[PDB]
Design a protein around this nucleic acid. Sequence first.
RNA 1: ACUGCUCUUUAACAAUUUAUCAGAUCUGUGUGGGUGGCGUGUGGC
Length: 134
Amino acid sequence: AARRRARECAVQALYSWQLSQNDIADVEYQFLAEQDVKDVDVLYFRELLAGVATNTAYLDGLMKPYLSRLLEELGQVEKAVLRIALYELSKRSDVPYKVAINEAIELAKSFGAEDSHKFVNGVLDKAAPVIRPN
RNA sequence: ACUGCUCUUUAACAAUUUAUCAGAUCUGUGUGGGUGGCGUGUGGC
């Protein structure tokens, strides 16, 4: 509940920067000093903000075609949760396929449009050939 | 050291009972506008 609830708090900073176009350092400083968030472990916050590496844009380019909803109309909350759900095993692979998938779908279940997690899980079929440690 | 192991492919609708044949006017800035109340005292006649 310390590394688990970590991601459901850094998705906030991710979306925040995405709307603000600031630096990730700015948004992380403001998020931490904004509310004392202990559901995230500080180092896992550091890892999730390192989850703004260029490869993240890359995991947007791979799963681009087989998206049941187009890129230039997807919700920013969906953009962030998608980046995280694909990055869970881009390099980190802290937990295997099912664990990280369920993590992304549930700990971000309370942010979508009542159905978004369905289609993000459905696009996760295109996530298979890059999430190899099944 | 010893919770976590895919939930399966982005919204799921309101308007609704006679009656219809759709069926004259865009003027101002002519003109003025832009000491006193009371008390008391003093005198006078």
